[PDB]
Amino acid sequence: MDKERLARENHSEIERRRRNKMTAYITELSDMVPTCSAKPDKLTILRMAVSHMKSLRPSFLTDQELKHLILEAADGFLFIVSCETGRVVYVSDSVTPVLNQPQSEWFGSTLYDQVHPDDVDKLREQLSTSRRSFICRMRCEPHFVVVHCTGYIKAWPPAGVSLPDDDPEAGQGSKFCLVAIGRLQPTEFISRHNIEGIFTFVDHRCVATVGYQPQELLGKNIVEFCHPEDQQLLRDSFQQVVKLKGQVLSVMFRFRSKNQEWLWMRTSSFTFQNPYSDEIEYIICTNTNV
Template sequence: MDHCKSETCQCGISSAASLNHSEIERRRRNKMTQYITELSDMVPTCSALARKPDKLTILRMAVSHMKSMRGTGNTSTDGAYKPSFLTEQELKHLILEAADGFLFVVAAETGRVIYVSDSVTPVLNHPQSEWFGSTLYEQVHPDDVDKLREQLSTSENSMTGRILDLKTGTVKKEGQQSSMRMCMGSRRSFICRMRCGSAPLDHISLNRLSNMRKRYRNGLGPSKEGEAQYSVVHCTGYIKAWPPAGMTIPEEDTEAGQGGKYCLVAIGRLQVTSSPVSMDMNGLSVPTEFLSRHNSDGVITFVDPRCINVIGYQPQDLLGKDILEFCHPEDQSHLRESFQQVVKLKGQVLSVMYRFRMKNREWMLIRTSSFTFQNPYSDEIEYIICTNTNVNGWKSSPNQLLFPNLTLHLSL
């Protein structure tokens, strides 16, 4: 009797141990599946696939991705490439000089400026010292604060949608990603208006600022007296862990709001805008072109003041009106087609010539070169930018019937 009880007890213990072992194995497999899924989300080549890859494929792609990030040859132990004949300071200077930009680091939680390179002076005419101790929210236009706050956010929900792959230039849909991917190494690319300063510039910095303004046509026109002047800046960078591993933050910096978990490391560069610089509008020569901005339907949302000398209209006479209202009836189909095509071309330049009705009711031959501006984060077209040029000063009366053939010119 006792022997049977003993056997029954042993069987029970064995069964319980077996069940316990199975439960441990099940949990281990679930954990492994969870980690593999997170790894798949972190590797761009995996997340871009239409079908979910198997575990072996995920591991193989993860290894390839880490190798590509680390690079091959001429790399130091931390994976950063630097030619032996350049110091770190010289390399940083060359990179920023080539980019016509400035490097800045801000705390993600507070927006507090942790670092800014001295090249901010020739770009925004700000002394480096003015950025230190301030927040990035103070440096951008008030209307862009919400956009900036969204870009500095490290929460998963705020960034679900589409992401810009800066390596391939494509925008991909992004589903529920792990918080690790959203926070550490997460890419950021956005455009905002940053306040320009009035710092006295040396001769070299002044020449560089002048050249950049000419190249990028970036100024937003002359500001009213007492108002801040802004320039449009394209910021690209990454959200990184802060402070870096092995680095400690002084107590006073922690109290100043620089002790958060993450920071934005980015380069700011002047961005092409649809507005002329002030020197364009103050020049002595009579302008033969003006810039305009339209929505996707062709309605004018902005026009620069040079239109007064070119077509005779005040800017307020054109705002809110369809460009087709000023186009010759015989040319409207061509102009309408050009606006439809430029939306499809996404950033490429399309040119068309047509007759434009001036303020004095005469017709002027205008060449309009247009391209779309796309939000780099959402891939949505925000507006169409047009450069409208008086072709050789050609004018005609409404009764003149002769007109050259219209052609569409595509700049690839």
């Protein structure tokens, strides 16, 4: 087939599909405007679409429509806090369907007062001095919920927003702010503990062994996961392995799995000695499903 004839046929097909797309979009316009659906030609449909758009009417959506789309897609609530003091500069109404807290409990407050104390220091490392993403525990006896926060550091005050003289923000003088969204959310594994039993290193295999992620174990004491009957046995094992450096001590206990289910675990522990001072750096445990 000569190339000129094939080119002409391709061009004719392109123009045909182009006209097809145009007529299909005109049909969609007829379906989208009031009294067209309730038959008109292309010109009448176009004029009625022009009138409808004129009545409806820069961004494609409004701020409220964009917020609606984002929240309908992935929940969350917006909060803008100061980097210096953590002062809550802004919090959206979405904090009520997320934390069961009114906007009053967050306004005039600080983010450190709204998170669990065990997170405060961590929070500081996320506020001092672009993108940010962390996980904390927010308030709601008191109750806490794990909240995943992701956002950014914006130079304050924001452009376009007017700051009146008699406004509570006029005297603050914050230079940067965190603008973020908060949302609600037969094998073995090795581990490293201190002399007290705190998980300082967790193998990734723990997920397949006890159902926990390594971050869920790190920092916690292993005895917290132990059955109260087996707790003194596990504690005496951790105490005796320190006195017998080099010797391997095995112990069976009941580990509380991710589903709050008891699993029989065999933990074999020994100590790591410094090649110079011969001091105990940590305790290496191999925890095996039974």
